[PDB]
């Protein structure tokens, strides 16, 4: 679909994963700045396949005249079995909206890839794709496209800006010790 973040940070692959995929204060501050409230999540849970599973719910406060003031959302995060601690993290995040128009007809798939670059460095790669169900006809999908890609771009750029500010204070704190 679209590649929104491709960057090497001066944060370890371990710390980057715990920043993004645990109930970190970093994520709480970032979600608030994006008007995402009432974040509820699970711990990472193992299943028979070997992959790990984490699910979240939250409410997105919307600025769209075509939508209501709020929409419920559900996120299912899949950490693939191929991941190795502090070395390689590959998460597939599927996001469902529940109160926007045509919410039954599409969802979003975000793939997060964290690979350790050096000793305290990592490369984060986030790609985004829209998925469709029930075969939305004609005008429905073009409306979905024009009301998603720009909001997803705005979302992940603010995350990259916050990760860079995090990199600047965390790498300094580690280096100074
Ligand atoms: C047809 C037309 C009336 C639809 C308009 C309303 C749709 C929204 C509001 O335009 C949706 C579409 C994609 C939705 C985003 C998809 C993925 C994520 C990543 C996750 O971490 C945090 C929530 C977030 C940013 C979702 C936010 C809500 C988005 C942006």
How many structural domains does the protein architecture include?
Answer: 1
Strand content: 35-45%
Radius of gyration (Å) = 17 Å
Ligand identities: 20alpha-hydroxy-20-(5-methylhexyl)cholesterol
Subcellular location: Endoplasmic reticulum membrane; Cell membrane
Organism: Mus musculus (Mouse)
Main location: endoplasmic reticulum
Domain VASt: 1-171
Short key terms for the protein model shown above:
Protein Aster-C; binds 20alpha-hydroxy-20-(5-methylhexyl)cholesterol; 38% strand; 8-stranded antiparallel sheet; 4 helices
How would you describe this structure to a colleague?
The PDB classes it as lipid transport. Keywords: endoplasmic reticulum, membrane contact sites, lipid transport. 31% of the residues lie in helices and 38% in strands. The chain is an alpha+beta fold. The longest helix is centred in the C-terminal third of the chain and has 28 residues, at 149-176. It is globular. It binds 20alpha-hydroxy-20-(5-methylhexyl)cholesterol (YK8). 20alpha-hydroxy-20-(5-methylhexyl)cholesterol (YK8) is lined by residues 60, 62, 64, 66-67, 73, 95, 97, 100-102, 108, 110, 143-144, 147-148, 151-152, 155.
